[PDB]
Write a protein that binds this ligand. Structure first.
Ligand SMILES: *[C@@H]1O[C@H](CO)[C@@H](O)[C@H](O)[C@H]1NC(C)=O
Lengths: 49, 49
């Protein structure tokens, strides 16, 4: 995902979330929407499965 | 060390009863928790007596 890193301050973990790593070629069964905003530097997350 | 997006209590930093010395200038030590600042910078290094 990257080569290296030097310095930073923020790091967030929150609750664990599980996926399925097996990929198929069938029809989709879920829909996920995400909204990313930045007002006065504040980062916003909006999502609902 | 940079402390950001955190909330902390300085009462537990004082009741340790193990610090040989403590000086704290620019603000009264009894009235610093209620006062609100923006960022806290902390540096750690060793020194002789
Ligand atoms: C990280 O290091 C760079 C030097 O390349 C410096 O410009 C930057 O201010 C540093 N970031 C912090 C948060 O100290």
């Amino acid at each position: 995902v990257y080569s290296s890193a030097n310095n930073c301050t923020f790091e967030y973990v929150s609750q664990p979330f599980l996926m399925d790593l097996e990929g198929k070629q069938g029809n989709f069964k879920n829909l996920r929407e995400f909204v990313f905003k930045n007002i006065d530097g504040y980062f916003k997350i909006y999502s609902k499965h | 060390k940079r402390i950001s997006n955190c909330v902390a209590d300085y009462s537990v930093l004082y009741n340790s009863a193990s610090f040989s010395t403590f000086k704290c200038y620019g603000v009264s030590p009894t009235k610093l928790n209620d006062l609100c600042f923006t960022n806290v910078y902390a540096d750690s290094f060793v020194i002789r007596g």
